Amino acid sequence: ETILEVNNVPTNATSLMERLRFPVSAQAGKGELCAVFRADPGRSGPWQSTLLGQLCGYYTQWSGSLEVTFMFTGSFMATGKMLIAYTPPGGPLPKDRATAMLGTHVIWDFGLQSSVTLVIPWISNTHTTGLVSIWYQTNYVVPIGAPNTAYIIALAAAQKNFTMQLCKDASDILQ
């Protein structure tokens, strides 16, 4: 498992560290779209932060199943349910939370499970990408004296049925 940079903000070079974390706050609302990224590692770019994605950069074609482990970094007292939905290649992201339900999805709570893990069934590279979508099932519930904003870290990796198949070389200089 390696950290999946879903959040992208380069200009703030001083604090490039923001790229490792989700913002989830009370100023949101039900069904609001928290985040969304593609389920293809070889392509740029949220997967490029992964050890997997850049090894794939050294290879040409590949196929296998992936899994993304989400870890909640909020307080013990913070609660709220979030919907993670997978939408397979072909067919766009669901219009709204309800339409994300009909496809394979996961109802994630912060109350009981601090870390949920999503399995990506299969993605090959026979040459769209697939699509991971995370939704706000509920409000972000927090008591007095507790932060109105928390952060999520996404950890991703491939499973043992993953194979890379043809060798290629990348882009980083010498001297």
Partner 1 sequence: GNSTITTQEAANIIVGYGEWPSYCSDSDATAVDKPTRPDVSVNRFYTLDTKLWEKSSKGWYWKFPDVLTETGVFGQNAQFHYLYRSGFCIHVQCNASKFHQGALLVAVLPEYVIGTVAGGTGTEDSHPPYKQTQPGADGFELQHPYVLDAGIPISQLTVCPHQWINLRTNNCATIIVPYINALPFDSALNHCNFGLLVVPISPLDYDQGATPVIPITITLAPMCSEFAGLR
Partner 2 sequence: SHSTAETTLDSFFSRAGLVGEIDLPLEGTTNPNGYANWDIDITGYAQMRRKVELFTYMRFDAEFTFVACTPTGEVVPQLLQYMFVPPGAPKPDSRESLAWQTATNPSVFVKLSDPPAQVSVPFMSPASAYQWFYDGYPTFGEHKQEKDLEYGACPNNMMGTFSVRTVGTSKSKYPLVVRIYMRMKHVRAWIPRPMRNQNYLFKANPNYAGNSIKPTGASRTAITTL
Contact footprint for partner 2 (CB under 8 A): 5-10, 13, 16, 19, 22-23, 33-36, 38, 44-49, 51, 53-55, 58-59, 93, 163-167, 169-175
Of 150, 155, 153, the closest CA to residue 75 belongs to: 150
Q: Which residues pair with 2 in a beta bridge?
A: 156
Residue 33 interaction partner, one of partner 1, partner 2, none, beta carbon < 5-8 Å per kind = partner 2
For residues 37 and 46, give the distance between their C-alpha atoms in angstroms, rounded to a whole number: 7
| Token couple for 23 | 């913002």
Between residues 96 and 124, which has the closer beta carbon with respect to partner 1? Answer: 96
Between residues 95 and 127, which has the closer beta carbon with respect to partner 1? Answer: 95
Nearest approach, Cβ of residue 121 and partner 2 (Å): 18
Phi-psi region of 130 (alpha: psi -120 to 50; beta: other; left: phi over 0): left
For residues 129 and 87, give the distance between their C-alpha atoms in angstroms, rounded to a whole number: 10
> Which residues of the shown chain bind partner 1 in the complex (CB under 8 A)?
1-3, 5, 16-17, 19-21, 26, 30-31, 49-51, 71-81, 83, 97-98, 101-102, 104-109, 111-115, 137-153, 155
